[PDB]
C-alpha cells in the first residue's frame, strides 16, 4: 500500500512539493527529495526531473513526482530517461488513467494550474490507482519500449 | 507553424478529423499520418512515433497527437530524439507549451474536453510564437544534451 516516491522540481513547482512530501508522509508513503532543496527563481528543470525518474526506474516499483509551473517541460525531461512514461496529471481522472492504461511511473503537476486541495487530490489518486495490467494496455507499452530500444519507427497500418 | 502533423489512435481518431478541417479552415496544412480509418483496437504508439519523426524532420512545422487522454501519445512523442510533446489541456497550457517549452508537438484528449473546447487549445498551439528567451532555451540545451549522451546532469546542491 506504502509507495516510494522520487519527487524533482523547479522555483516554480517548488512551494507544492513540499506540500506533497508532507502529505505522502502523512498518508503512509515515503517521499524522497530529489531537489530543488531551496528556492532559487533562476533554477533549470531538467536537472531535477532527469534525477527523479532515473532513479524511478533504477528502483522498479516505486513511483515518481516532477513539478513546474506547467509541469509540461518537467514531463517532457522525464520521458527522455530510458525506462521512464511520464504523463501529466491536471485532474484525478489523468492521475488515476495514468496509471490504469499508461502504467507511468511518473506524473508532472503545474504548480500554478492547480490550488494545494486539487494538486494533493490528484496526487492521491496517482499513488493508489493500480497498473490495470489489461493486454492492449500492455502491448502499445511494449511497442513503445521496442522503439525505446533502437529508435526504429514502427510502421503505420 | 503551417504544416501540421497530426497522428492518433481510435480514441482521438474522430477529433483528429474535425482537427484537420478546422486547420484547412484557419489556413493553414494539416498531414495525416494515421490513423486513416477508426479501428478500435489500433495502438497509438506507431501514429505518434510518425507524427513526432516527421515534425522534427520538418523546420517550422507543428504536430498534434490525439488520444483518449493524449498522455500516452505525448509520452510516445517525446521518445523521439529532439521532439518535445507537452500535453495541452487548456489554452493556457497549449500557449505555455509553446512561449516556455518551445514544444513542437502537443497532446490532447479527445475524452476530456468538448470539440469546441479542443478547437481553441488548437488555435491557442499554432499561434502563439516561441519566445527565443535566454532561460527557456537553456533548460532546452541541457534536455537536448541529456539526450545525446545520456549523462544526468549534476543537480544543484
Ligand atoms: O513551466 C515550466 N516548464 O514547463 C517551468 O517551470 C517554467 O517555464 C519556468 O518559468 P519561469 O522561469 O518564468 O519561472
Ligand atoms: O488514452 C490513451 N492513452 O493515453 C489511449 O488512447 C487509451 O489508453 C486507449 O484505450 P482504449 O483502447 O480503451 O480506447
Not at 516505486?62 to 506547467?70: E, H, R
Not at 499508461?102 to 499513488?127: P, Y
Not at 497498473?131 to 500492455?138: E, L, N
Request: charged residues 20%; proline residues 5%.
Amino acid at each position: 500500500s506504502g509507495m516510494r516516491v522520487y519527487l524533482g522540481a523547479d522555483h516554480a513547482g517548488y512551494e507544492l512539493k513540499q506540500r506533497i512530501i508532507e502529505h505522502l508522509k502523512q498518508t503512509g508513503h515515503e517521499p524522497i527529495d530529489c531537489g530543488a532543496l531551496r528556492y532559487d527563481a533562476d533554477d533549470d528543470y531538467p536537472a531535477f526531473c532527469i534525477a527523479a525518474a532515473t532513479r524511478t526506474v533504477a528502483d522498479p516499483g516505486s513511483l515518481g513526482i516532477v513539478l513546474g509551473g506547467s509541469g509540461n517541460g518537467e514531463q517532457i525531461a522525464a520521458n527522455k530517461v530510458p525506462g521512464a512514461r511520464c504523463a501529466l496529471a491536471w485532474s484525478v481522472q489523468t492521475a488515476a488513467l495514468a496509471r490504469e492504461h499508461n502504467n507511468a511511473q511518473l506524473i508532472g503537476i503545474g504548480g500554478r494550474m492547480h490550488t494545494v486541495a486539487e494538486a494533493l487530490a490528484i496526487v492521491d489518486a496517482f499513488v493508489t490507482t493500480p497498473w490495470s495490467k489489461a493486454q492492449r494496455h500492455q502491448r502499445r507499452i511494449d511497442i513503445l519500449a521496442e522503439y525505446e530500444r533502437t529508435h526504429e519507427a514502427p510502421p503505420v497500418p
